[PDB]
């Protein structure tokens, strides 16, 4: 989905941002505002549970382990599609180059074949009529 995705967002997103809060104040301890700090912790607990609720239905979703590594290397997916895209080039090269290998291969083939006896005559029915 998206708006449960987007919930994981703005909520759990809010959870990261709240952390921005957490650190930024927790550089500086005022003897009590740990009240504010630990109320953020309180936010952390109401989160963590609510999250996991948002997290055991999150599906642990099937693991693109490597492309994981790739975004575990932070290298974002799009480059994946991109890089296999570059392969897909190389591969379209191979495949259709081979068709060419054919289209000449046959072509120059039949060329000489004619420059040789083009005389698989009767069965050239199928042959010619096969072109």
């Amino acid at each position: 989905m998206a708006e449960k995705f987007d919930h994981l967002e703005e909520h759990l997103e809010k959870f990261v941002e709240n952390i921005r809060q957490l650190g930024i104040i927790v550089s500086d301890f005022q003897p009590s505002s740990q009240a504010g700090l630990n109320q953020k912790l309180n936010f952390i607990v109401t989160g963590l549970q609510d999250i996991d609720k948002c997290r055991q239905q999150l599906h642990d979703i099937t693991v693109p382990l490597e492309v994981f590594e790739y975004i575990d290397q932070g290298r974002n997916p799009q480059l994946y599609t991109k890089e296999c895209l570059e392969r897909a080039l190389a591969k379209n090269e191979q495949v259709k180059g081979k068709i060419d290998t054919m289209k000449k291969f046959k072509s120059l083939l039949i060329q000489e074949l004619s420059k040789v006896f083009p005389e698989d005559m009767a069965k050239y029915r199928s042959i010619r009529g096969e072109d």
Partner: protein
């Protein structure tokens, strides 16, 4: 072509002819990993 028969072409535009840093240890875990009264 065969994206032609594989519909990815939008992703062609997007995705015809940074990332980590772009869009703005632990992994080993990922391999082998009244509270107010307390503190």
């Amino acid at each position: 072509n065969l994206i032609t028969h594989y519909n990815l072409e939008q992703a062609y535009n997007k995705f015809c002819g940074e990332k980590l840093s772009n869009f703005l240890s632990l992994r080993s875990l990922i391999e082998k990993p009244g509270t107010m009264l307390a503190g």
